[PDB]
Design a protein around this ligand. Structure first.
Ligand SMILES: CCCCCCCCCCCCCCCC(=O)OC[C@H](COP(=O)(O)O)OC(=O)CCCCCCCCCCCCCCC
Ligand SMILES: CCCCCCCCCCCCCCCC(=O)OC[C@H](COP(=O)(O)O)OC(=O)CCCCCCCCCCCCCCC
Ligand SMILES: CCCCCCCCCCCCCCCC(=O)OC[C@H](COP(=O)(O)O)OC(=O)CCCCCCCCCCCCCCC
Lengths: 262, 98, 258, 262, 257, 98
C-alpha cells in the first residue's frame, strides 16, 4: 500500500498553527520529497511521522498501524522500522564512530558484540566512510559527518528512512556522493526515502512524488515535472526563481515618498 | 522463527526468516554446535529462506569466520536474491564466496 | 508603550513560574520515569568524569587559595585580640560551614554549571538530542539523567575536597608562613567544630545546592532555544541562576541551622 | 584593465600553505565567481583581497594601487571601494537595522543625520527591506537577515563587492531574490561582483568568469560553459556529480577482507 | 602512549604561556592602539549597560543574601564568645576586607564574564568582527575596548554596591531577628573599620580582579573558534576568571593583611 | 570638486563629481543659502555632473525636503546616466520630478 499516511492531521506550538488539517501520502519504494519556503516547518512534518512530536489531532499510518495510538512497548518496536538523517549528522559526541553507528543496534537488539562489528563495518562500507571506524565525530569534516549518520540510520535495515535537509551547505562533490548514496539505498534495498530539503534544484532529480509544504498546509503534490508546470501561483513562484509573487519581495513599508521626505 | 538442522555431516540448511531476533540464537546453535564436527567441505544451502536482512548476512558472515579458524572451508549455495541485494549494496560481492 | 511595558514585565514574571513548573516536571520525568534501553551505569561514570573529575583542578586550587586567604585574614583579625593560636578553629569553622559549600557552589556552578548547560544545549541544537528520540532512547533518562546523577554525587564530594584542601592550605600559611604552633592549630581545631553541628551541617548545605545547581544547569540546557546564541545565553542564565540559588538556598539552610 | 589583480599571492596559516603562488584576475563589471571543495580556503581568499588578512607574500592590486603596501590612513580610504556580504548576514546584533545599514556611512563620512536617512532608505528600498528600518537583527527572519547586509554593503556606492556563500542554505524563493539582486547590482550599477560559494549550478548560472580553487592552488579559470567540458579530472569531477574520481570516495581503510575477518 | 602525552603536555605548557602573551598583546592593541574612526562614548555607555546595569539584579540580591548569611553566622559563632556586639565589626570586615570584594568577582565573572565572552565570541562566529575590518573600523577598539572599559569601571561599583547591600542586610538581620542592640552594632562597626586599611583596600582589591576578570572574559571570546567553540570558551573564561579572582585575592591580601 | 549657483531664477546648476567629499558642502550651500533666495518653479539642472554616487541623489533628495519647507515647486532637468542608474535600482524614478 503506502508507507506513511497522515489523514486529517494538524499540529500547533502554543497556538501558532504550524500545520492545519494537512495530509500526506507517501508511496513505499519511491523517494518522495517535501519542501517549502523558509519557516514552513518541513522539519516539523518530519518529526511527526517519526513520533518525535505528538500530533494535536489526526493519525499517522506508518507501515500499517498508526503510531500515536500505540503503547510504548509497541512504539519502541516500531522505532525499528525507520531511521533518520539530520543535517550536520547529529552524531553523538560522547561515542567514537564505531559506537556511533552501533548505537541503534545496542538499543533495539541484543546481538553478540562481534556481530555488531560485522554489521557496522558492512554498513560503514556501503556508505564509504568505513576507514574511520575509530575516529571521533569532531575529527570528521562536515562532509563525512553526515555519511556516518546515514550509516547509523541504515542499521537494523529500516524499511523507511527520512532525511532532514541532507544536501544543504556542502560542495557539489560531497552532495553528489550523498545523493548517489540515497539513490543506491532506495533503489537496491527497496526502502522508502523522504528527502525533506527546501533546495528544489537538487531534490527534483531524486524526487519521485515530491510534495510542497507552506503556510501550514499541503501545497500540492506530484512528480517533479508536473510541479514544474503546476500553474499554481505560489507553487509556480516556488518551483522557479520569480522573486515577487504570493510571497512578497518587499517589506510592508509605509511609503517610500513618505519615509524619504517626511 | 528459523532453525538450523541437517548439519555435522555435510550440507547444513537454513530456515525462512533470519530477522534480528533469530540472529543470536541461530548463530550460537550453528556457530559451534554444527561447525565443530569437522566432517567435510560444508555447504550452506539457503534454499527455504523466505525473508532476511543484514543480520542474516552477518550470520552467514560469522559462519565463515570460524571455519577460517577451524581450518575447514565452507561456501554458500542458493543465496536468496534479497540477501543478494543486501550484500550487493555494500562492496561485499566476493568476500562471501559461493 | 508603558502599559505594554507592564504587560511584558508580567509576561516575563509568569514565564518564570511557568518555566519553573516545566523544569520540575522535567526533573520528575528524568529522575524516576522508566528504565530506557540505552541506560546504564557507564553513563553515570562518563558524566562523573565530565562533571566532577574535570572540575577537580579548579576546585582544589580554589580550596588552597581561599584557605590561605581565610587564614592570612583571620590571623590579622585575631592578632589584635591575641587568640591567634585559635586561627585553626576559624578556617575550619568558616570554610566548612559557610564559605566552603558556598564557594564550591559558586564555582561548581561556574564550571560544571556552565559546561553542562552548554554541552546538552549544543546537543539539543545539533539534533543529537532529538535523534535519540527516533532511535527510541528517551533523552531524559539517557542524556540528562546521568548529568543529574553526576551532579548530585559529585558536588558534595567536591565540597568535602574543597574544605579539606582549604583547611590544609590555611594551616600551611598560619604555620609555615605566619608561625603558630602546628599542634596548637590542629588541637584547638578539633575541640570546637562539633561534627554533628558543623561538618554534617556543611555537607547537607552542600547537598542541597548539588541538587539545586545541577538541576538548573541541565534544565537550562535542555530548554535553550536551538541556536548558537540561545546556547550562549543559556550558559549565562544558568550561571546567574545557579549562583543566585547557591546564595539564597545557603541563606535558608543556615537560617534553618545557625 | 581588470579590477582585482593578484600578483603571485601566497598564504599560509601556521605553515599550512592555504594558498600557494595563486594568480587570479577579476574582470571589471563582470560578476565573477570562485569556488571549490569543502575547505579549500575560499573564505580566506575573500578576506585576502579585502585586506582583512595579511598576505604572507604577494600583492593584491585593487583599482590601481595595491592594498597591503599602503598606510593605515590610506587603506582605510580604500575601504570605500568594496563591501562584503557574508552568509548568515554578519549583522550587528546591537544596532537596529537603520543604524546597521548606516554604519559604513557613519564611519567614512561625516554627513548630516538627515541626509544619511535618504541614503539608507534608497539603499534599502532597492534591496526591498525598507520596511523593517527599525527592527533589530535578532528579530529579522533568517532570510531577510542577508538582504539588509547586502544593503549595508552597497552603501557608500562601492565599485566592487564580495559575496561569501550568498546562495547556500535558503529556499529558492529567497535565493531567487538574492541572485536577482546580485545580477541587478552588476547590471544596473555596473559594479564588479565576486561570488564565493560552492553552489555549482547557481554560480555557473550567474558568474561570468568563474575560477575554481582546490587544495591550495588555482584549478583553472574561465567562462562557465568552458569549465563544463574541460575534462580536467578533478575539475570534471567537481563540475559534475560523479561522486568518485581524483578525490577518493572511500576513506583509507585497511582491507575489506581484513577489517571484517580479523 | 607516555611520550606522546608528555609531548602534548609540553605543547599545552607552551600554549598557555604563549596565550598570556597573545592576550597581553591583544589588551595592548585594545586599550591604547589608536583612535578608530567609529568609536566614541556611546559604545562605552551601551556596553556599560550590558556589563554593569544588567548585572545589578544579581549582585544586589547576592549582597543581601551573603550579608544576612555573614551576620546570622558570625553571631552564632560569637554567641559563645560574649561579644555579640562585634557583629557590626564583622559584616563590615569579612564582607568588605575579603569575601565581599571576592564574591563580586566570582559572580561578575559569571554573569558578565560569561555573557561578555559569549557576546564577543558569537560575534566572531557570525562573521560580525571579520565584517568590521572590511568597513575599516578596528574591531579591537570598537567591539572589545568598550567591553574592557565597561568592565574596569563597572566591577568596582558593583563591589561597592554589593558591600553596601551586604552591610545593610547584616544590619537588618542583626537587629530584627537577632535582637542585637542597633546602637552598639553601628557603633562598633563605625569605630573599628579603619577606612585607609579596609575600605580602600577592598576597593583596590576589587579593581585588580576587575582589570583581570574583564581582560580574560573579553579575550577568551576574541580568540575562540563555531557554537561548540563559544560554548567551551565561556566555560573556560568562567573557570579562569574564578581562578584569577581567588589567586589575585590571595596575592593581594598577602601584600596587605 | 563641486559647485552650485544660478539661484533666484531657476536653472539651478551643479558641478562635477559628487562623492562623500562634496556631499555636505553642497548640501549646506544649497540647503539654506540658495533656497532662501529662490522664487517659484525652482528648476535644478545637473548638466555638468562628471560623475556621481548615491550621495548625489540624496543631495537631489535634500533639495526636495526643503523645497516642501520652502514651498517653491521644483523639478530636475538634464539628469545624467549614472544618477539615472542609481535611481533605477532604488526605483525612485517618480520621486525625482523631471
Ligand atoms: C528576607 C527575605 C528574602 C529571602 C528570599 C528567599 C529566596 C530563596 C532562594 C531563591 C532560590 C533561587 C533559585 C533561582 C532559580 C530561578 O530563578 O529559576 C529560574 C528558572 C527559569 O528561568 P528561565 O526564564 O530562564 O526559564 O527556573 C528554573 O531553573 C527551575 C529550577 C529552580 C529551582 C528552585 C530551587 C528549588 C528548591 C529546592 C529545595 C529542596 C531541596 C531538598 C532536596 C534534598
Ligand atoms: C573570605 C572570607 C573572609 C572573612 C574573614 C574576615 C575576618 C574579620 C573578622 C570579623 C570580626 C572581627 C571582630 O570584631 O572580632 C573580634 C572578636 C571578639 O572581640 P570582641 O569581643 O572584643 O568584640 O574576636 C573573635 O573571637 C572572633 C573574631 C571574628 C569572627 C569572624 C570570623 C570570620 C567570619 C566568617 C564567617 C563564617
Ligand atoms: C597592586 C598590584 C596590581 C595588580 C596587578 C594585576 C596583575 C595581573 C596579572 C593577571 C594575569 C592574567 C593574564 C591574562 C590571562 C589570559 O587571558 O590568558 C588566558 C590563557 C588561556 O589559554 P588557553 O587558550 O590555552 O586556555 O591562560 C589562562 O587561562 C590564564 C589563567 C589566569 C590565572 C591568573 C592567576 C594569577 C595568580 C596565580 C596565583 C599564583 C600561585 C602562587 C600560590 C602559592
Amino acid at each position: 500500500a503506502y508507507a506513511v499516511e497522515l489523514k486529517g492531521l494538524t499540529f500547533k506550538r502554543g497556538s501558532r498553527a504550524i500545520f492545519d488539517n494537512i495530509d500526506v501520502r507517501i508511496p513505499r519504494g519511491k523517494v518522495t520529497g517535501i519542501m517549502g519556503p523558509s519557516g514552513c516547518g518541513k522539519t516539523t512534518l518530519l518529526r511527526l511521522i517519526a513520533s518525535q512530536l505528538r500530533p494535536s489531532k489526526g493519525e499517522v499510518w506508518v507501515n500499517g498501524q498508526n503510531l500515536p495510538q500505540l503503547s510504548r512497548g509497541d512504539l519502541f518496536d516500531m522505532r525499528k522500522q525507520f531511521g533518520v538523517l539530520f543535517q550536520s549528522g547529529a552524531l553523538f559526541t560522547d561515542l567514537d564512530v564505531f559506537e556511533n553507528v552501533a548505537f541503534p543496534l545496542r538499543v533495539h537488539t541484543q546481538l553478540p558484540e562481534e556481530m555488531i562489528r560485522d554489521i557496522v563495518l558492512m554498513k560503514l562500507q556501503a556508505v564509504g566512510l568505513r576507514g574511520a571506524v575509530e575516529l571521533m565525530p569532531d575529527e570528521l569534516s562536515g562532509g563525512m559527518k553526515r555519511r556516518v549518520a546515514l550509516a547509523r540510520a541504515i542499521a537494523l535495515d529500516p524499511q523507511i528512512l527520512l532525511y532532514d535537509e541532507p544536501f544543504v551547505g556542502q560542495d557539489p562533490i560531497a552532495m553528489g556522493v550523498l545523493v548517489r548514496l540515497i539513490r543506491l539505498l532506495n533503489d537496491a534495498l527497496g526502502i522508502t526515502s523522504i528527502v525533506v530539503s527546501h533546495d528544489l534544484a537538487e531534490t527534483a532529480s531524486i524526487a519521485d512524488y515530491i510534495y510542497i509544504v507552506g503556510d501550514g498546509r499541503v501545497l500540492g503534490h506530484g512528480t517533479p515535472d508536473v510541479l514544474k508546470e503546476t500553474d499554481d501561483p505560489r507553487i509556480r513562484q516556488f518551483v522557479k526563481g520569480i522573486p515577487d509573487g504570493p510571497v512578497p519581495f518587499h517589506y510592508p513599508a509605509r511609503d517610500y515618498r513618505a519615509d524619504l521626505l517626511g | 522463527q528459523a532453525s538450523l538442522r541437517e548439519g555435522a555431516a555435510g550440507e547444513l540448511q537454513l530456515a525462512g526468516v533470519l530477522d534480528y531476533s533469530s540472529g543470536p540464537a541461530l548463530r550460537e546453535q550453528g556457530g559451534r554446535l554444527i561447525r565443530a564436527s569437522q566432517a567435510a567441505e560444508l555447504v550452506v544451502d539457503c534454499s527455504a529462506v523466505e525473508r532476511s536482512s543484514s543480520v542474516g548476512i552477518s550470520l552467514l558472515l560469522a559462519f565463515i569466520r570460524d571455519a577460517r579458524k577451524a581450518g575447514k572451508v565452507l561456501s554458500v549455495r542458493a543465496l536468496p536474491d534479497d540477501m543478494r541485494e543486501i550484500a550487493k549494496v555494500s562492496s561485499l560481492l566476493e568476500i562471501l564466496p559461493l | 508603550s508603558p502599559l505594554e511595558r507592564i504587560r511584558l514585565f508580567g509576561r516575563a514574571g509568569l514565564d518564570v513560574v511557568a518555566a519553573l513548573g516545566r523544569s520540575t516536571l522535567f526533573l520528575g520525568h528524568a529522575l524516576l520515569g522508566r528504565r530506557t534501553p540505552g541506560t546504564g551505569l557507564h553513563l553515570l561514570v562518563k558524566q562523573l568524569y565530565s562533571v566532577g573529575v574535570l572540575s577537580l583542578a579548579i576546585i582544589v586550587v580554589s580550596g588552597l587559595f581561599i584557605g590561605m586567604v581565610l587564614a592570612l585574614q583571620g590571623y590579622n583579625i585575631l592578632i589584635s585580640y591575641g587568640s591567634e593560636q585559635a586561627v585553626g578553629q576559624m578556617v575550619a569553622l568558616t570554610l566548612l560551614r559557610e564559605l566552603g559549600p558556598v564557594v564550591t557552589g559558586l564555582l561548581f556552578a561556574g564550571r560544571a554549571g556552565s559546561a553542562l548547560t552548554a554541552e546538552i544545549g549544543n546537543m539539543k541544537a545539533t539534533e543529537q538530542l532529538s535523534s535519540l528520540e527516533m532511535i527510541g532512547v528517551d533523552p531524559l533518562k539517557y542524556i540528562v539523567a546521568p548529568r543529574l546523577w553526576a551532579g548530585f554525587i559529585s558536588m558534595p564530594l567536591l565540597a568535602a575536597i574543597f574544605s579539606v584542601v582549604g583547611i590544609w592550605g590555611g594551616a600551611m600559611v598560619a604555620v609555615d608562613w605566619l608561625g603558630v604552633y602546628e599542634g596548637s592549630f590542629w588541637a584547638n581545631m578539633q575541640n570546637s567544630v562539633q561534627f554533628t553541628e558543623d561538618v554534617l551541617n556543611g555537607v547537607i548545605k552542600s547537598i542541597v545546592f548539588a541538587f539545586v545547581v545541577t538541576w538548573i544547569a541541565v534544565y537550562q540546557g535542555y530548554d535553550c532555544e536551538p541556536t548558537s546564541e540561545g546556547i550562549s545565553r543559556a550558559t549565562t542564565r544558568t550561571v546567574v541562576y545557579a549562583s543566585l540559588a547557591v546564595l539564597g538556598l545557603d541563606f535558608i539552610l543556615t537560617a534553618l541551622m545557625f
